[PDB]
């Protein structure tokens, strides 16, 4: 039942015993592996057992398991659930749950950081207006003038008798995508839909490719409300190249803070539909995906041409050459602007360190090989060469449907 897992560079071998504590099925069966799929196809007595489970996790972690407080806390949960069908987490438990859900995130290469997360309790929130205020303090704290600090902010749990608090935007900072006459897109094509919903709910659009979108925030069973982030909070890094001086001409820029805003956080059976969290970028996310995917800004040809590369033929590897300059430019420009970033070499090295830690601490580490291995130079990094077991542990960030 316990997989042999091998590193092929170093010949080293471990066994995952941690997977045994997974109790949510993934999409694979013995007939066919489905691990490369981005999304899944996708309660009285049972919320109860996830709660015991989780409270157990919490008291084991402060090394006070089977102590008195443990018992009296299990009794709280029971009594609360028996009468109301639900319960509430103490602030310190939430803090524990939030860090554990990062820890369990199998798609995340930055997990070495997991124990260092600033947790904002925003459960005493009753309006879109307040969410905005909480969302602003988060951006301000996490951004920290370029010296970035991981942070999550947690809005009120989902409740049986009403709508969810939701942030409609997929990220706290997004560039407008304007769907043009000839069906081309000025700006980020990833953000066409959200851009149109913002216009639909009253927003005045610009005509740049890097227009910072407003936030569409929704309090339960209310029309979402629109807030313009103040430009002074959203820090942005102009893109240039250490030697290629025309690179600066291309007006390229990315924003400092990668803050995911549409995922749901699950802890001990409670669900937190709005709980944005942020760290700092690994440079390939910007330099390779956001700028080079052909269904994003798709700037590879432009760059290659400016680099005077023979475009005609795949075999001159013009794609590979320009991709590498753009990634260098993202690192260069971030290090200049003194904004926190990490390259895929440093990041995957530190990730290797994390597997070793997690092997000593828990007996394994859930890991999604296709998301961990970077999008350029995969086998140049040590994770390419490391087998990994993937599986769902709770607490967990999960995808959730879009509100509209």
Ligand X SMILES: C[C@H](O)[C@H](O)[C@H]1CNc2nc(N)[nH]c(=O)c2N1
Ligand Y SMILES: Cc1cc(N)nc(CCCCCc2cc(C)cc(N)n2)c1
Annotated catalytic residue within 19, 108, 198, 292: 108
Q: Which does 61 bind (CB under 5 to 8 A by kind): ligand X, Zn ion, a copy of itself, none?
A: none
Phi, psi dihedral angles at 53 (to 5 degrees)? -35, -50
Q: Which is nearer to ligand Y, 282 or 355 (CB)?
A: 282
Of 82-90, 179-187, 221-229, 276-284: span binding ligand Y (CB under 6 A): 276-284
Q: What residue has token string 């597997």?
A: 355
Number of residues interacting with a copy of itself: please give it, by CB under 8 A: 68
- Sign of the Cα torsion 77, 78, 84, 85 reads positive
For this structure, is 91 an active site residue? no
- 28 binding Zn ion? (CB under 5 A): yes
Binding mask 344-383 for ligand X (x = CB under 6 A): --------------------------xx------------
For this structure, is 280 an active site residue? yes
- Sheet strands (E) in 231-331: 236-238, 253-255, 259-260, 264-267, 270-272, 277-278
Return the residues of window 380-399 that contact ligand HEM according to CB under 6 A. 397
User: What six digits make up the tokens of 63?
Assistant: 């090394």
Q: Tell me how far CA of residue 108 lies from CA of 18, 117, 282, in angstroms.
A: 18, 14, 11
In 3-state terms, what secondary structure has residue 372? helix
Asked whether the beta carbons of 15 and 2 are under 8 A apart, the reply is yes
What's the closest the beta carbon of residue 386 comes to ligand X, in angstroms? 6
> Strand 185-187 to strand 215-218: parallel, antiparallel, or no bridges (unpaired)?
unpaired
Of 13-21, 127-135, 248-256, 384-392: span binding ligand X (CB under 6 A): 384-392
What's the closest the beta carbon of residue 284 comes to ligand Y, in angstroms? 10
What's the closest the beta carbon of residue 83 comes to ligand HEM, in angstroms? 32
Q: What residue has token string 């459960």?
A: 123
- Sign of the Cα torsion 336, 340, 341, 347 reads positive
Identified binder of ligand HEM from the candidate list 150, 283, 381, 394, rule CB under 6 A: 150
Residue 12 is labelled as binding a ligand: no
Q: Which is nearer to Zn ion, 28 or 346 (CB)?
A: 28
- Sign of the Cα torsion 111, 116, 120, 121 reads positive
Q: Tell me how far CA of residue 160 lies from CA of 139, 149, 335, 399, in angstroms.
A: 30, 34, 47, 19
Return the residues of window 26-55 that contact a copy of itself according to CB under 8 A. 26-38, 41
DSSP character for 225?
E
Annotated catalytic residue within 225, 240, 285, 358: 285
Look at the chain and count its residues: 404
User: What six digits make up the tokens of 33?
Assistant: 């592996």
What's the closest the beta carbon of residue 378 comes to ligand X, in angstroms? 8
Phi, psi dihedral angles at 73 (to 5 degrees)? -85, -35
Q: Which is nearer to ligand X, 203 or 384 (CB)?
A: 384
Identified binder of ligand HEM from the candidate list 5, 48, 105, 286, rule CB under 6 A: 105
Return the residues of window 263-292 that contact a copy of itself according to CB under 8 A. 288-289, 292
Identified binder of ligand X from the candidate list 387, 392, 400, 403, rule CB under 6 A: 387
For this structure, is 196 an active site residue? no
Asked whether the beta carbons of 223 and 134 are under 8 A apart, the reply is no
Asked whether the beta carbons of 241 and 329 are under 8 A apart, the reply is yes
Residue 306 is labelled as binding a ligand: no
For this structure, is 8 an active site residue? no
What's the closest the beta carbon of residue 152 comes to ligand Y, in angstroms? 9
Annotated binding site: 28, 33, 36, 108, 171, 280-281, 285, 290, 370-371, 384, 399
> Which residue ranges make up the site for ligand X (CB under 6 A)?
8, 36, 38, 370-371, 384-387
Catalytic positions, please?
108, 111, 280, 285
């Amino acid at each position: 039942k316990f997989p042999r897992v091998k590193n092929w560079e170093l010949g080293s071998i471990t066994y995952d015993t941690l997977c045994a504590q997974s109790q949510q099925d993934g999409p694979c069966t013995p007939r066919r592996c489905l691990g490369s799929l981005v999304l899944p196809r996708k309660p009285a007595e049972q919320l109860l057992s996830q709660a015991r489970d989780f409270i157990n996790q919490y008291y084991s972690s402060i090394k006070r398991s089977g102590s008195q407080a443990h018992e009296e806390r299990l009794q709280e949960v029971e009594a609360e659930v028996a009468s109301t069908g639900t319960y509430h987490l103490r602030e310190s438990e939430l803090v524990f749950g939030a860090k554990q859900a990062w820890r369990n995130a199998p798609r995340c290469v930055g997990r070495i950081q997991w124990g260092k997360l600033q947790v904002f309790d925003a459960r005493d929130c009753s309006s879109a207006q307040e969410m905005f205020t909480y969302i602003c303090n988060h951006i301000k704290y996490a951004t920290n003038r370029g010296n970035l600090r991981s942070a999550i902010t947690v809005f009120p749990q989902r409740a049986p008798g009403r709508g969810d608090f939701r942030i409609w935007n997929s990220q706290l900072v997004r560039y407008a995508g304007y769907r043009q006459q000839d069906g081309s897109v000025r700006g980020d094509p990833a953000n066409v839909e959200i851009t149109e919903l913002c216009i639909q709910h009253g927003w005045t659009p610009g005509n740049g490719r890097f227009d910072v979108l407003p936030l569409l925030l929704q309090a339960p069973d209310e029309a979402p409300e629109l807030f313009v982030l103040p430009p002074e909070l959203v820090l942005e890094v102009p893109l240039e190249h250490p030697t290629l001086e025309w690179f600066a001409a291309l007006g390229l820029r990315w924003y400092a803070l990668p803050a995911v805003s549409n995922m749901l956080l699950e802890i001990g059976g409670l669900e937190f539909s709005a709980a944005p969290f942020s760290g700092w970028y690994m440079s390939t996310e910007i330099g390779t995906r956001n700028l080079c995917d052909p269904h994003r800004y798709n700037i590879l040809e432009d760059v290659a041409v400016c680099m005077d590369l023979d475009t005609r033929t795949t075999s001159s590897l013009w794609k590979d050459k320009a991709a590498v300059e753009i990634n260098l430019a993202v690192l260069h420009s971030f290090q200049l602007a003194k904004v926190t970033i990490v390259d895929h070499h440093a990041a995957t090295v530190s990730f290797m360190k994390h597997l070793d830690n997690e092997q000593k601490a828990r007996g394994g580490c859930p890991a999604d090989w296709a998301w961990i291995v970077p999008p350029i130079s995969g086998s140049l990094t040590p994770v390419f060469h490391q087998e990994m077991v993937n599986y769902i542990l709770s607490p967990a960030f999960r995808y959730q449907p879009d509100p509209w």
